[PDB]
Design a binder for this molecule. Structure first.
Ligand SMILES: O=C(O)[C@H]1O[C@@H](O[C@H]2[C@H](O)[C@H](O)[C@H](O[C@H]3[C@H](O)[C@H](O)[C@H](O)O[C@@H]3C(=O)O)O[C@@H]2C(=O)O)[C@@H](O)[C@@H](O)[C@@H]1O
Ligand code: CA
Length: 241
């Protein structure tokens, strides 16, 4: 399966290990999955973020290939551990890839793709929030563009609190800015902006659904000395057009 729609809630599972074959079962395919980092706590998907490590070394980075399209949406629930250590931040939740799915320090300035993902950050003063993490044709930096948005707008997200993310993406056409990146958290729009993902109409299309959970960042201070847990539930992916 290279699906076009998925409805996972993990209720059919015993509290215990979650397999990469379990992953491919519920997902149709699961690229770089690491079952040492998955587990099924009380009917929720628990990814683990291990101590003293960053990025893929410490987290889970799978790309679920999905039926190509031009408009896609997904909804998911996510809950940081009640005793979680925020630290500086990292990537969280389900996102979309377009064309070459530009990540890393690889900006989509060539016009050949990008991503639409979310992160959490904590400022020097300690405000903690959700933020957009985008890669597109016109992203200002080497790294992901946040459009200076944050959820909440003021104050902080809080540990153990279930947030419902709605993600929505629409391929643009040619060199026009007729694309879309939309992110709604608990009913509030964080981001709803026209965007120019790509300028090469061959990488124009949405190709797969990212599942990228990790700390960092790449500097040493994004890390954390304990192992850490993030819980997911009730994912509904759906191809639109
Ligand atoms: O303290 C900071 O805010 C610090 O962040 C640095 O930029 C980060 C950027 O925030 C982002 O976190 C990003 O995350 C990467 C990570 O590098 C790694 O590449 C992972 O493979 O991919 C993530 C992603 O796909 O982009 O990486 C940037 C990085 O610097 O690590 C800088 O802005 C730093 O100066 C700033 O003070
Ligand atoms: Ca569930």
């Amino acid at each position: 399966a290279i699906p076009s729609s998925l409805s996972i809630n993990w209720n059919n599972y015993a509290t215990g290990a979650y397999s990469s074959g379990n992953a491919a079962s519920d997902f149709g395919n699961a690229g770089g999955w690491n079952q040492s980092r998955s587990y099924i706590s009380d009917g929720t998907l628990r990814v683990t973020l291990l101590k003293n490590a960053l990025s893929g070394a410490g987290g889970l980075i799978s790309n679920i290939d999905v039926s190509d399209g031009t408009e896609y949406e997904l909804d998911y629930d996510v809950r940081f551990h009640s005793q979680f250590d925020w630290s500086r931040g990292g990537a969280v939740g389900f996102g979309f890839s377009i064309g070459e799915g530009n990540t890393g320090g690889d900006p989509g300035w060539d016009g050949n793709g990008g991503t639409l993902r979310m992160a959490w950050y904590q400022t020097d003063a300690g405000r903690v929030f959700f933020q957009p993490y985008i890669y597109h044709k016109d992203q200002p930096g080497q790294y992901g563009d946040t459009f200076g948005k944050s959820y909440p707008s003021s104050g902080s997200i809080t540990k153990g609190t279930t947030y419902h993310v709605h993600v929505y993406i629409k391929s643009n056409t040619g060199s026009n800015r007729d694309g879309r990146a939309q992110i709604i958290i608990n009913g509030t729009t964080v981001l709803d902006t026209a965007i120019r993902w790509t300028t090469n109409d061959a990488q124009r299309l949405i190709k797969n659904m990212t599942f990228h959970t990790f700390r960092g960042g790449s500097q040493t201070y994004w890390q954390s000395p304990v192992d850490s847990y993030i819980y997911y539930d009730n994912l509904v992916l759906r191809k639109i057009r």
